[PDB]
């Protein structure tokens, strides 16, 4: 009942960057990480992707 | 149509004059009056106008 959710709110999303490096010696990020409001993200569950 | 209206006369300049530079010791100063924030080398939140 009380720790079951039914909203449509996801679980799995995936996050891009905006106006980045490229270069030869450093290749550098820009994630605006914006979570939604009334909504936790846990950060061992979250990596990158090559 | 010629010249004065698009293009002028001035005394030169070596380098392009006074241009403004947003130096910046951000991590201290929260946001002075109108600035928000993004840490890295791609838009780093601004104190103020400087001379280079």
Known sequence: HDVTTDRSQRLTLRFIPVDREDTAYSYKARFTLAVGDNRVLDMASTYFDI | ?52
């Open chain 2, 1 to 52: 149509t010629g010249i004065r209206s698009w293009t002028l006369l001035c005394t030169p300049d070596v380098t392009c004059g006074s241009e403004q530079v947003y130096w910046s010791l951000p991590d201290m100063m929260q946001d002075p009056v109108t600035f928000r924030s993004t840490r890295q080398i791609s838009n780093f939140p601004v104190v103020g106008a400087e001379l280079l």
